Amino acid sequence: NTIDVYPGNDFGDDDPQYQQALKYDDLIAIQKQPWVASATPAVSQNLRLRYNNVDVAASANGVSGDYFNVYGMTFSEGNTFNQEQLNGRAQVVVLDSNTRRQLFPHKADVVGEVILVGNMPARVIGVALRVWLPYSTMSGRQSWLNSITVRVKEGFDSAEAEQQLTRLLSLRHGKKDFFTWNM
Numbered sequence: 001n002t003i004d005v006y007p008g009n010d011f012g013d014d015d016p017q018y019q020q021a022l023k024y025d026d027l028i029a030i031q032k033q034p035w036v037a038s039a040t041p042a043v044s045q046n047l048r049l050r051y052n053n054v055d056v057a058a059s060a061n062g063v064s065g066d067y068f069n070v071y072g073m074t075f076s077e078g079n080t081f082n083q084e085q086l087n088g089r090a091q092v093v094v095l096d097s098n099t100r101r102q103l104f105p106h107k108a109d110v111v112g113e114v115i116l117v118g119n120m121p122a123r124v125i126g127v128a129l130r131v132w133l134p135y136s137t138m139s140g141r142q143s144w145l146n147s148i149t150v151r152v153k154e155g156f157d158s159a160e161a162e163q164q165l166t167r168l169l170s171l172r173h174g175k176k177d178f179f180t181w182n183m
Contacts, residue, residue, distance in 0.1 A: 003162055004064065004181045005148040005169070011179065012072045021177035022145040022169075029172060030148065035156040035164065042135035042147035047118045049131065051103040058099055059130045060117050061146055062138030068094075068128060070181070076100075078111040078126025081134050089136040093122035096130045158182055 007021035008014070030039045044061040065081045068074075076097065085092060093115060095103075104110050113124045118141070122133060135147065152161050162182045170176050 001152055001158065002183045003150040003152065003158065003165060004066070004070075004183060005150060005165070005178060006070055006181070007146065007178055008071075009177070009179065011070055011181075013179070014071055018177040019146065020144040021173065021175075022148055024145065026169060026172060027145070027148060029168060030150055030165065033164070033168070035153050035161040037151040037153045039151070040135065040139070040149045041145055042149070043138050043141070043143050044146045045118075045138070045141065045143045049099060049103055049115055049117060051113075051115045054103050054105075056099065056102050056129060060138060060141075061130060061132045062135035063132050063147055064135060064149060066181075067132065067147065073128045076127040077109060078124070080126060086134045086136055090134065091117075091120060091122045091137055092125045092134070093117060094126045094128060094132040095124060096128050096132075098129050099131050100127050102129075 007018040027039055027041050030036055042062045042064060044059060047058060047060045049056050049058045065083060065086050068080050100110060103115060110124050110127060114121055115124060152158050162180055166180055169178055
């Protein structure tokens, strides 16, 4: 019913070699196929994070709920998004270690705090110079892709759909810098 698409050679492939291996043109190429119900991108921008007079250049990454497990990331503090928050387009944010250390130089716990992603307020709900938000929260906002969710059409076997997706993307890159997850 749902096929996610991530950059990297497989699950856990953290290598920043491939972090933009997915393009918007790939999105258009996917949407154009019969078995595709929809294809929502997960977009990422460079922005400036400000909190009580401190400002750091950072990267807001719109991701899905499973992004951290997919790249084998563990949480120093807090949780990840749940699907009511992803579908509610809620404004919650996960910091990485360095964003936390510089916008909150010595605070004991940070979950509940409110930072300003660009000019949109976001509530810190966890910690893992990058910050992550629900892709639905960022979809309305020069950028790149870090994930693609592909909803399949009814009547279509998701496996042969996954194989046509895989041969599509693989035919459009000249590499296999990506991997899929058929959920």
